[PDB]
Amino acid sequence: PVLSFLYRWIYDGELEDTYHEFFVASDPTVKTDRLWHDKYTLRKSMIPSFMTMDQSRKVL
Amino acid sequence: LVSGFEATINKFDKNFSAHLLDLLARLSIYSGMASVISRLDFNGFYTERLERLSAER
Amino acid sequence: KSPNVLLQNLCCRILGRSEADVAQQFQYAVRVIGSNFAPTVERDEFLVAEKIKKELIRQRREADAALFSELHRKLHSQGVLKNKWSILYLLLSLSEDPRRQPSKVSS
């Protein structure tokens, strides 16, 4: 399932999780020019160990 | 008769000037958008000769 | 304290003259304050605060405009005045441009 969360976050920026199983930390109701500034925060517990930090800063 | 002509013309002239200045005052609040004020007095007469002084309130 | 002698102290603060020297000005002073004892414009201390701020931005003293936010805070902190909007408008109505102000007062 993380290879169905790290195989569509690479391509089309499509994600949906209810309980957080991935390092996307959304901020609600941000669709303006603060979208380039927010709605994403690199949560540091949902990054798997075979990845590295640069891989996770790129997909975001 | 010049009370049926000239005095009546002056009464109408007074009322027309009053309506005109009230129109220009109520038109100045409205923000080619200000061309409506410019066209009516392009020479610059009959427009805001008095500012309507502020009271001691 | 009664307001009529309290207004009589005001006319001897602005004028240098005594109250047995002039009573003609003070009669005119009650003529303007009286019957205009309730607000002739609507109140908000928020808008008047943003116009003392916009004046300090106009002078590019914008470190003092955020020091002013603590000066607007102190007036709320006592809470004995409810006409906090009025006295800020009063210094704003009598405001002029120094082009700059240096050596700050308060505390």
Binding site: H37 | - | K51, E55, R58, R60, E96, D97
Partner: protein, 61 residues
């Protein structure tokens, strides 16, 4: 119209507009006149608010 800046594309000519910085009697006309040149669209993410405030200080000097 009298000077040569009318070779500009219409967008930036529409984006600029005179900005007032508040009436204060005793203040000459030179100190309150500055253009705004606001910015909207997707390009506004590069030109943040803090950038515009610092440009206003540069203009005032």
């Amino acid at each position: 119209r009298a000077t040569n800046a009318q070779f500009d594309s219409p967008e930036i000519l529409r984006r600029l507009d005179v900005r007032l910085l508040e009436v204060s009697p005793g203040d000459t006309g030179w100190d309150v006149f500055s253009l705004d040149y606001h910015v909207d669209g997707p390009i506004a993410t590069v030109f943040t608010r803090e950038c515009m405030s610092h440009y206003l200080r540069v203009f005032n000097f």
